[PDB]
């Protein structure tokens, strides 16, 4: 089978030097254009680039020339973009992709990921956020955690050890001050709150802080 | 240089149901070498049509691109659950190489009204002098919404932290947080604490509110 | 893979002295090689196939007039500024407008305008270079076995039975050793480099399709072009046009879509089709086939016991040798088939030779298929199959009598030597001698006289054969045939080689 | 123009259909004759002057159906 | 040092500096380096004669790594010939041009 | 084609100080043809030098014009309270005609306050359903000031309108006058109403507020 293989996706500082593998698999490395696409976080794929597998040319878009090294390891079969001066514009998932050639690129490395930013591991700041009069709903009691001030993501964040898997909505973790909050809000019935613990288990690997805050009443 | 927009940006959909999503070479006559390129969230992208023609092999005849060299359709006749996704279309006939502005497959359904629940900064917060106010609105479809934090009547737009779910896995619906983060210092200078929320179920904000004041 | 059913079938004749052979072998042709101790193989190329190829420039054969803006000055006012001029994207143009005091000026007789139409492509088009490393050959390589319509025919079959193989050389793999399983192995050592000139050409799309085109001829193109990557173009004007001036009003026209044109453009320009890569059917190249490891089975087996019956009848291939594939009765196979190719029954004396040298029963399976071609004579014949009762023959003829062979292979010797230039003399294979200094002496010569006026095409050098032949008609002798040498062939032969 | 100057031959290896191949078969003639024969004011005049110069007969028919051809296209 | 006992593969594909020779670098999967590197300038595989001249003589692996790239020259010599780098098994070899 | 600027844009001076008011010419060597243009507020334009180098004949020696070409400079050594005047400078060596942002002369003098007075919307306006709150913030020097409006609090930028005089003839100072304009709903929804104002004579805001729940 053929398969685009690259490295994992990298937390990086502005000012660094990342370089992305591409590793060729289950095709004839040399034949087909090895190509080099820019997904940002936001943005969708913008293509960088592609670097000629015969001769191991380059060829970048007017955009990624001068920044990003392309680079083809030919035995090995694997493929290369080389960003410098990381930037945190280079925080982004990154995609190899093996030409088809006029016929495009069929298709991609698992994706690669890069963070270009300052910040240091941080935990999480993990708040039970209780509901009040009219934070009840129905027979429902919506609960909260807000996952406060943590580099970088994820966190792990369950509820009763995740056995509060539905009324559950952990929301997306987001950049604040390079640190990230998330506030994850369950959605329990009033007659198992507060009458059952209703516990925010919230796992930070990368700080390796493991925070559990049951919401009481206020 | 050469531009391709892929319209819609999004279509609500039921599955087995016919969205063709759109396409257009702005420049030459792209004629073949334009693609589909299926990536859903958090994956590498997956290649559909090729020559804007032709079904990948993975792919199956359910997807079809259409039109030819200035103006293309990504047809799925019957759409899926499966088939739920971000596709995009690329022009291969020149480098640079580049890709349109996608079209999202939504899996259409009931429209579901924000569970809306706004939370005060935990007293866990307030003792760190941070004052959050958390705000839940949960289970909405559409996606279209809106968070408007009101302060003493004055609607304060500063500190608003939202964070929302995409469509609801089980109900396909959509869930949000609108967080307030105040200064305790202003937390405390300030009393009714109103989040509203406004949603296409709802001709009004669904208004989610605590004065201080009270309890 | 095989010459099976191949338009152009050609039969390469071992004549010993190297297990290794030089061989000029294409995608059109199949060579079919019959030699001494080895079964009979077949080369040929499946495809020209570049893998991976790099975009040289692009083109704007359909242009799009777009905002046409012309800002006017009076008589006098002499040069006319229209801001646009900073954008290339605009096309402006000078010029002016003669005015009375009816139209904007106090003066009359002269004026100034600046036309700025902005430019856009309607419709451009690309070329691009082969990398001569990405340049792949896909050569079909087989031998001629125990073998039926289908096995023959479907390669998956000839892979098992070893008497096939496909492969692909590059400058850098330029030699493949490849093995025939019981009939041992065999090697081609090739030219990858020198199979084309990468950079004689480009590959030019125009549409979804792509062309060959002359990359000295593909800057020739006058025409809105392009950076290989993206924008800023050059005659962008050429494909849009200007007007009068009427008052301040001139007008820019886009061309009619030029794109006929461009196919009207490609004459001599081969279909390329991009599917991962180009794949050119046209073949050159120059491998050497090594027969060494190559072997026989069927020296062991004795005579097949069993009664021999036609699965398909005597028929040509259309080179000049009779194809059958018999049932065979006998499931003594694996067994070596009993055949000949004879003249009459009178006599048991072959006249022929055997195509598919080793003719043998495959499998024990009776009534088994098994197709094999064999070379019938000139004139009628029979084939003796077998000796014996159990011998079937069919009558056969063969209308090519002997002299007609040495004269088409004589005026195929023009016809080899044309079109293949220096390289007409690779015919010699394992050369020396004359076909040493052959070349050597067409070396420069084709590399001179020919190519030297190049650049003519039918009537055109078509036409010099008489006005040249003239000259040789009224000169003077020891002058008339030098004066003749640039008359006939070279010039004739290829004007008289295209009838038609 | 694109039409004109076409890149037949192309003639590299290429034994093989050209893109566009029979196209070349008539192009010289027929429209130069199509010219001439749409003029065939044109064409009597231009060739008795083949007969005028150079009095040396069979060169002096040579002149004209160039010159025939030469008018037509230029 | 004895000939490189493995291996080679092209680093670089055969470059002609446009001067008349022509460097290849070598990844050599050989880690029996320190070693001299088997190579030539050969006309066609069947003759093992050196047909050019090396321009860097005595081309050397400098260490045991294995598919260490080595960038080595010599001269091609007029019309077609080969680069047989190494021997045998461990021969890869690169058909190269000088058209001069 | 070719620009100018003309530094400084204003300049407060003691009136026979000497303050030369620079000017350079972006392009080409403007050679002679530059030429200085006192505008007071309301005028048409005074030409003032000629060659940038010569007076005119309307205009007194204090004036000195200077530089060359690619630079020039206005010169009064003795400023005066008629020199208070809005200074041009045009390259005309090129049509087009152009001038450079001009240089003010304007008469120094001690620092003063805004005399910063609040005036909520009269019965008059409160009876016609439209609220402004008037703030006149009168003879402060510099002209330098920033007004704010504060409302409960909280900051109200608009309905925020603002007047001011120009340096004023006798103490030389400025007067303002910060203007909020309100909707007699919410001019009513909310109470505490305030014109601060941090001028160059104070470190802070000068409030000047009332409640309407004051008087």
């Known amino acids: 089978q053929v398969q685009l293989m690259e490295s994992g996706p990298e937390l990086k500082k502005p000012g660094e030097t990342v370089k992305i593998s591409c590793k060729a698999s289950?095709?004839?490395?040399?034949?087909?254009?090895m190509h080099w696409v820019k997904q940002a976080p936001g943005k969708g794929l913008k293509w960088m680039g592609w670097?000629?597998?015969?001769?191991?040319?380059?060829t970048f878009a007017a955009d990624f020339k001068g920044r990003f090294a392309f680079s083809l390891e030919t035995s090995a079969s694997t493929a290369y973009l080389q960003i410098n001066n990381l930037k945190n514009e280079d925080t982004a998932s990154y995609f190899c992709?093996?030409?088809?050639?006029?016929?495009?690129?069929?298709?991609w490395g698992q994706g690669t990921s890069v963070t270009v930013s300052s910040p240091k591991t941080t935990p999480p700041s993990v708040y039970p956020l209780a509901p009040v009069c009219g934070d009840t709903t129905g027979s429902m009691v919506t609960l909260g955690c807000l996952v406060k001030g943590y580099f970088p993501e994820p966190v792990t964040v369950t509820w009763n050890s995740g056995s509060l898997s539905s009324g559950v909505h952990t929301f997306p973790a987001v950049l604040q001050s390079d640190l990230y909050t998330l506030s994850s809000s369950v959605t329990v019935p009033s007659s198992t709150w507060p009458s059952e613990t209703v516990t925010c288990n919230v796992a930070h690997p990368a700080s390796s802080t493991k925070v559990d805050k049951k919401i009481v009443p206020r | 240089d050469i531009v391709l927009t892929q319209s819609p940006a999004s279509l609500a959909v039921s599955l087995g149901q016919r969205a063709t999503i759109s396409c257009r070479a702005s420049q030459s006559v792209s004629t073949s070498y334009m693609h589909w390129y299926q990536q859903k969230p958090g994956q590498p992208p997956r290649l559909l049509i090729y020559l804007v023609s032709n079904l990948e092999s993975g792919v199956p005849s359910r997807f079809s691109g259409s039109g030819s060299g200035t103006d293309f359709t990504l047809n799925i006749h019957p759409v899926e659950a499966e088939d739920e996704a971000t596709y995009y279309c690329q022009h291969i006939r020149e480098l640079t190489r580049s890709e349109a502005g996608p079209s999202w497959l939504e899996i259409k359904r009931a429209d579901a009204a924000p569970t809306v629940s706004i939370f005060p900064p935990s007293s866990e917060q307030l003792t760190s002098g941070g004052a959050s106010v958390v705000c839940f609105l949960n289970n909405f479809y559409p996606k279209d919404i809106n968070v408007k934090w009101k302060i003493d009547g004055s609607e304060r737009q500063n500190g608003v932290l939202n964070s929302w779910t995409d469509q609801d896995s089980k109900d396909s619906t959509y869930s949000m947080s609108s967080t307030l983060t105040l200064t305790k210092d202003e937390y405390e200078r300030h009393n009714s604490y109103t989040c509203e929320a406004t949603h296409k179920t709802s001709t009004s904000p669904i208004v989610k509110s605590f004065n201080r004041n009270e309890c | 893979f095989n010459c099976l059913g191949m338009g152009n079938r050609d039969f390469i004749e071992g004549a010993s002295g190297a297990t290794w052979v030089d061989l000029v072998l294409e995608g059109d042709s199949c060579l079919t090689i019959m030699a001494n101790d080895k079964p009979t193989l077949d080369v040929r190329m499946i495809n020209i196939e570049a893998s991976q190829l790099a975009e040289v420039r692009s083109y704007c054969y359909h242009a799009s007039v777009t905002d046409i803006s012309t800002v006017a000055r009076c008589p006098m006012t002499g040069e006319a500024h229209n801001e646009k001029r900073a954008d290339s994207s605009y096309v402006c143009k000078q010029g002016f407008t003669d005015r009375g005091w009816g139209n904007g000026c106090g003066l009359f007789g002269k004026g100034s305008i600046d036309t700025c139409a902005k430019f856009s492509c309607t419709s451009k088009a690309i070329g691009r270079t082969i990398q001569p490393e990405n340049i792949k050959y896909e050569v079909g390589i087989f031998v001629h076995g125990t073998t039926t319509s289908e096995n023959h025919g479907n390669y998956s079959a000839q892979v098992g039975a070893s008497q096939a193989a496909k492969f692909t050389v590059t400058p850098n793999a330029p030699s493949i050793t490849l093995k025939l399983g019981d009939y041992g192995e065999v090697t081609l050592d090739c030219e990858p480099r020198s199979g084309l000139n990468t950079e004689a050409f480009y590959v030019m799309t125009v549409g979804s399709k792509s062309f060959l085109v002359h990359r000295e001829w593909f800057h020739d193109l006058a025409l809105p072009w392009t950076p290989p990557s993206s924008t800023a173009w050059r005659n962008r004007e050429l494909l849009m046009e200007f007007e009068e001036a009427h008052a301040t009003k001139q007008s820019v026209v886009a061309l009619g879509s030029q794109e006929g044109g461009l196919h009207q453009a490609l004459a001599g320009a081969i279909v390329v089709e991009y599917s991962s890569s180009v794949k050119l059917t046209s073949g050159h190249l120059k491998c050497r086939l090594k027969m060494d490891k190559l072997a026989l089975k069927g020296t062991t087996y004795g005579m097949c016991t069993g009664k021999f019956s036609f699965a398909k009848n005597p028929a040509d291939t259309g080179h000049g040798t009779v194809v059958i594939e018999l049932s065979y009765s006998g499931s003594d196979g694996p067994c070596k088939i009993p055949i000949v190719s004879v003249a009459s029954l009178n006599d048991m004396t072959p006249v022929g030779r055997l195509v598919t040298v080793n003719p043998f029963v495959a499998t024990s399976s009776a009534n088994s298929k098994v197709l094999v071609e064999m070379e019938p004579p000139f004139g009628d014949s029979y084939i003796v199959v077998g000796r014996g009762d159990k011998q079937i023959n069919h009558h056969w003829h063969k209308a090519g009598s002997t002299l007609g062979k040495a004269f088409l292979t004589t005026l195929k010797g023009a016809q080899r030597l044309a079109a293949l230039g220096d390289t007409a003399w690779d015919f010699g294979s394992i050369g020396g001698v004359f076909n040493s200094i052959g070349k050597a002496v067409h070396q420069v010569f084709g590399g001179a006289f020919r190519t030297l006026f190049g650049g003519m095409s039918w009537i055109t050098q078509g036409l010099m054969g008489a006005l040249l032949l003239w000259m040789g008609v009224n000169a003077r002798d020891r002058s008339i045939a030098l004066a003749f040498l640039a008359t006939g062939g070279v010039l004739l032969f290829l004007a008289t080689n295209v009838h038609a | 123009s694109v039409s004109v100057q076409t890149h037949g031959e192309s003639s590299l290896v290429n034994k093989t259909e050209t893109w566009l191949d029979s196209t070349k078969a008539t192009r010289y003639l027929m429209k130069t004759e199509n010219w001439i024969i749409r003029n065939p004011g044109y064409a009597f005049l231009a060739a008795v002057l083949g007969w005028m110069l150079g009095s040396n007969n069979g060169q002096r028919v040579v002149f004209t159906i160039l010159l025939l051809l030469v008018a037509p296209a230029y | 040092y004895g000939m490189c006992t493995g291996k080679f593969s092209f680093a670089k594909n055969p470059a002609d500096t446009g001067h008349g020779t022509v460097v290849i670098e070598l990844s050599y999967s050989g880690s029996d380096g320190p070693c001299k590197i088997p190579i030539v300038s050969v006309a066609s595989l069947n003759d093992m004669t050196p047909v050019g001249r090396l321009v860097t003589v005595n081309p050397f692996v400098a260490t045991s790594s294995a598919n260490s790239k080595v960038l080595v020259e010599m001269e091609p010599p007029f019309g077609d010939s080969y680069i047989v780098v190494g021997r045998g098994d461990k021969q890869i070899n690169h058909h190269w041009h000088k058209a001069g | 084609d070719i620009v100018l600027t003309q530094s400084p844009a204003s300049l407060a001076v003691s009136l026979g100080q000497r303050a030369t008011i620079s000017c350079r010419a972006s392009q080409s060597v403007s050679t002679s043809y530059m030429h200085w243009y006192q505008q007071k507020p309301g005028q048409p334009p005074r030409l003032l030098i000629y060659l940038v180098s010569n007076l005119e004949s309307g205009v007194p020696s204090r004036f000195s014009g200077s530089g060359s070409g690619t630079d020039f400079t206005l010169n009064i050594h003795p400023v005066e309270a008629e020199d208070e005047a809005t200074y041009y400078c045009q390259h005309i060596r090129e049509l087009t005609r152009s001038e450079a942002g001009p240089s003010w002369l304007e008469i120094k003098r001690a620092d003063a306050a805004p005399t910063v007075s609040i005036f909520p919307p009269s019965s008059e306006q409160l009876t016609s359903g439209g609220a402004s709150v008037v703030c006149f913030l009168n003879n402060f020097y510099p002209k330098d000031i920033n007004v704010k409006w504060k409302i409960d609090g909280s900051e109200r930028q608009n309905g925020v309108l603002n007047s001011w005089t120009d340096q004023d003839s006798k103490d030389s100072t400025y007067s303002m006058s910060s203007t909020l304009t309100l909707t007699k709903d919410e001019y009513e929804r909310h109470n505490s109403y305030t014109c601060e104002a941090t001028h160059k004579t104070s470190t802070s805001p000068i409030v000047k507020s009332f409640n309407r729940n004051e008087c």
């Open positions: 289950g095709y004839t490395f040399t034949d087909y254009s």
């Open positions: 992709a093996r030409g088809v050639g006029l016929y495009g690129v069929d298709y």
């Open positions: 670097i000629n597998t015969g001769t191991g040319e380059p």
